[PDB]
Amino acid sequence: SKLEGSEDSLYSDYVDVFYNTKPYKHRDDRLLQALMDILNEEN
Numbered sequence: 851s852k853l854e855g856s857e858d859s860l861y862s863d864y865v866d867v868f869y870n871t872k873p874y875k876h877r878d879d880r881l882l883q884a885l886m887d888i889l890n891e892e893n
Contacts, residue, residue: 851857866872
């Protein structure tokens with residue numbers, strides 16, 4: 851066991867969430883989408 855069915859550290863996620871680390875490159879395309887809007891009302 852412990853290696854069949856995505857059973858690799860299921861609780862390890864609870865820790866990482868406490869580190870506040872995940873979006874280092876992008877993860878959630880929000881910052882970029884914000885710049886596109888800047889020109890939405892400026893033609």
